[PDB]
Write an enzyme that holds these catalytic residues in place. Sequence first.
Site, PDB file in Angstrom:
ATOM      1  N   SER A 112      -4.692  79.774  75.107  1.00  0.00           N
ATOM      2  CA  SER A 112      -5.056  78.362  75.050  1.00  0.00           C
ATOM      3  C   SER A 112      -6.140  78.024  76.119  1.00  0.00           C
ATOM      4  CB  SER A 112      -3.811  77.445  75.164  1.00  0.00           C
ATOM      5  OG  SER A 112      -3.253  77.405  76.485  1.00  0.00           O
ATOM      6  N   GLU A 235      -8.625  80.656  67.483  1.00  0.00           N
ATOM      7  CA  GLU A 235      -7.464  79.848  67.108  1.00  0.00           C
ATOM      8  C   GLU A 235      -7.507  78.478  67.779  1.00  0.00           C
ATOM      9  OE1 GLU A 235      -5.215  79.421  70.845  1.00  0.00           O
ATOM     10  OE2 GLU A 235      -4.126  79.027  68.997  1.00  0.00           O
ATOM     11  N   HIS A 303      -0.782  79.836  68.974  1.00  0.00           N
ATOM     12  CA  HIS A 303       0.304  79.007  69.476  1.00  0.00           C
ATOM     13  C   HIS A 303       1.640  79.137  68.708  1.00  0.00           C
ATOM     14  CE1 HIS A 303      -2.890  77.117  71.829  1.00  0.00           C
ATOM     15  NE2 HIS A 303      -2.006  76.354  72.452  1.00  0.00           N
TER      16      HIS A 303
HETATM   17  N1  LIG Z   1       7.898  68.995  74.646  1.00  0.00           N
HETATM   18  C1  LIG Z   1       7.516  70.098  73.967  1.00  0.00           C
HETATM   19  N2  LIG Z   1       8.169  70.464  72.852  1.00  0.00           N
HETATM   20  C2  LIG Z   1       7.847  71.533  72.116  1.00  0.00           C
HETATM   21  N3  LIG Z   1       6.824  72.333  72.460  1.00  0.00           N
HETATM   22  C3  LIG Z   1       6.105  72.096  73.584  1.00  0.00           C
HETATM   23  C4  LIG Z   1       6.386  70.942  74.416  1.00  0.00           C
HETATM   24  N4  LIG Z   1       5.501  70.980  75.424  1.00  0.00           N
HETATM   25  C5  LIG Z   1       4.681  72.050  75.249  1.00  0.00           C
HETATM   26  N5  LIG Z   1       5.042  72.691  74.128  1.00  0.00           N
HETATM   27  C6  LIG Z   1       4.510  73.948  73.578  1.00  0.00           C
HETATM   28  O1  LIG Z   1       3.761  74.590  74.570  1.00  0.00           O
HETATM   29  C7  LIG Z   1       2.493  74.967  74.050  1.00  0.00           C
HETATM   30  C8  LIG Z   1       1.515  75.017  75.205  1.00  0.00           C
HETATM   31  O2  LIG Z   1       0.265  74.645  74.774  1.00  0.00           O
HETATM   32  P1  LIG Z   1      -1.036  74.707  75.695  1.00  0.00           P
HETATM   33  O3  LIG Z   1      -0.924  73.352  76.347  1.00  0.00           O
HETATM   34  O4  LIG Z   1      -2.169  74.747  74.718  1.00  0.00           O
HETATM   35  O5  LIG Z   1      -0.944  75.841  76.694  1.00  0.00           O
HETATM   36  C9  LIG Z   1       2.241  73.885  72.993  1.00  0.00           C
HETATM   37  O6  LIG Z   1       1.226  74.215  72.069  1.00  0.00           O
HETATM   38  C10 LIG Z   1       3.613  73.755  72.363  1.00  0.00           C
HETATM   39  O7  LIG Z   1       3.850  74.847  71.480  1.00  0.00           O
END
Ligand SMILES: Nc1ncnc2c1ncn2[C@@H]1O[C@H](COP(=O)(O)O)[C@@H](O)[C@H]1O
Lengths: 333, 336
Positions: A112, A235, A303
Amino acid sequence: MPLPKSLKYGDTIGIYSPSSPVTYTSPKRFERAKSYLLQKGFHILEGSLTGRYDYYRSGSIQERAKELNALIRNPNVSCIMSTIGGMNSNSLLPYIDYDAFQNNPKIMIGYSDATALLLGIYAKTGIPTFYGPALVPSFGEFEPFVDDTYKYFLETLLHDQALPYNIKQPLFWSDEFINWEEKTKEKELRPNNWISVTNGQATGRVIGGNLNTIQGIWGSPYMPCIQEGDILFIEDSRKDAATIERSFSFLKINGVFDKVSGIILGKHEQFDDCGTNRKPYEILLEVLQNQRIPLLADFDCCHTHPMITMPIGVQVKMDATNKTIHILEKWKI
Amino acid sequence: SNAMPLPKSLKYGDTIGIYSPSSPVTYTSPKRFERAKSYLLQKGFHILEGSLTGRYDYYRSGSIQERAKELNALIRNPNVSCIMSTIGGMNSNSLLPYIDYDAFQNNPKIMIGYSDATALLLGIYAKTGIPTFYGPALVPSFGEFEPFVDDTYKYFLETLLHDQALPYNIKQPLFWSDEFINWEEKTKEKELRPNNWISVTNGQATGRVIGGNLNTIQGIWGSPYMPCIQEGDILFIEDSRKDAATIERSFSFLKINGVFDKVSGIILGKHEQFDDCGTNRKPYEILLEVLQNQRIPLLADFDCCHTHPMITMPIGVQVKMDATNKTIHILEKWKI
Ligand SMILES: Nc1ncnc2c1ncn2[C@@H]1O[C@H](COP(=O)(O)O)[C@@H](O)[C@H]1O
Ligand SMILES: Nc1ncnc2c1ncn2[C@@H]1O[C@H](COP(=O)(O)O)[C@@H](O)[C@H]1O
């Protein structure tokens, strides 16, 4: 092309938070992720911003650069892993000690927003970096999927591998938005398929990561130049159709599709199709305007759970028709 | 510099062509659309409705090819004096490979709009060298209820119609608002907030102004459609309805591209409905952290952005910014 040493049991994984302060806001998943890896036999060195909070980020630009550089400079750390993404990793790029990294190559892994750092370090040092697990989202996941992510992690970073290395498709996946801090139900198992969107084959250096994040580094010294024959890996997650059309067209107008020999497109977690019922590869197909570039879609390095660990910056053959991906070049010692 | 091709000034009775390069606002907000149309017709302009007017394709007005066809039909029409976007969105950059730049170069027109239309404003300037205008889009800008619409109109007329002796002083508006209300129907008077610009970092700069909506610029950067930033340029940037994380990423994107090593000064618009994520920081404070120890003259809360009213700013011409005294003057002709 200089390479990092393979991970070993008993090694120390340094963790840092270049953007969102997840170790403050999601303590239960953070503790679970640490415990998972400790049980497997790795040690965790918590970077200096662990537990700190600055609203949308872990700390100031200078403090985040200091946190990462302390891990880069530490000879006892064999793997440096982001805790999670966010938006703000690209702020660190002018401040990173690339010379220290190049003098003692280590495994750099995450996904990400950490794409900014993965690609910046590869662009500056020529050392492959890894699009793969970040500690909290990836290893704080509950069973079953965490164990599949972990198997792919060992396969790429720890196991001896003979070339070519076939990257195998998982039997099941999920993008379900549930079970973050606490487990309520089982996630539905989704049967898996990779998609042959446009048939064909391509061989060349793989370059890419999170596409939205790439637009925060494009044009700079931290974005590796895309070369004739490269394979584009991209992605995105939790965006809508409007956002990804803009991102696909950004690549188009930059001439990227005139250069690359093939495209590998990750699954898109919780995609919002804006009512169109169009899939992300269909929006990409419109932008491509019938240019015939082999295209393999729904790749599980994104993701969704579980996650493959992909080396970036090495030769790959993709076959879109037969839905296969092989790494042709060594990524580690 | 040498005299260059310039679009003809707008005249009373001219025809304004409208097109929808991204969001299908003429379908989704018909009341504001008809009001904006009626506003310009009352002043004695004619409105030529682009081929996608009233059409709907979810997030967009139509396919990439339909949208290019719409805009090209206006570009190729000798009777249209001004080409104005109806609203922004996300998807204007899709059009860039397909625009007839040759036809625009053959018959230059005033090209005006804001936000996502920045992709097209900068793309046309990059390809043709013809100045374009960061200014009103039909529905948000001219569909605004009184009083603010009358101020936006005054600046539009002053910049595009009236003859102007150079240097042309851009006056500070007396009042503004970002309130998210009175879109289709009026329920209350917007607050008339007393206005100021902000001298963030003192000093003066004179150079070619380049910029627009900064988020949209990340969708064209590096391409043939993004004009190269040159030593001495003045960077003009605005964003709207973003959070502190998003704008830090955009400011660091400029930093790592060496933009702040080139520019002599920065003009930052107001940020409509900015989400500070609980930090209580202003957008210029986040920009200044990214600038670190580099001092650059900076004038903020400039009224050429998503807040009301809106100034019309020529892009691609020499400007003098004085951040200490909060003035902006245009130094070179933008129309003939
Ligand atoms: N409250 C939440 N509930 C479910 N998934 C979460 C939550 N917070 C973060 N994520 C997951 O964590 C990932 C981290 O994304 P990133 O911010 O792109 O590193 C997200 O795309 C979600 O899959
Ligand atoms: N439902 C609404 N209520 C109030 N203002 C709106 C609404 N929809 C759009 N707008 C305004 O129209 C602008 C459109 O911006 P853009 O999409 O950037 O061209 C927004 O930034 C708001 O100022």
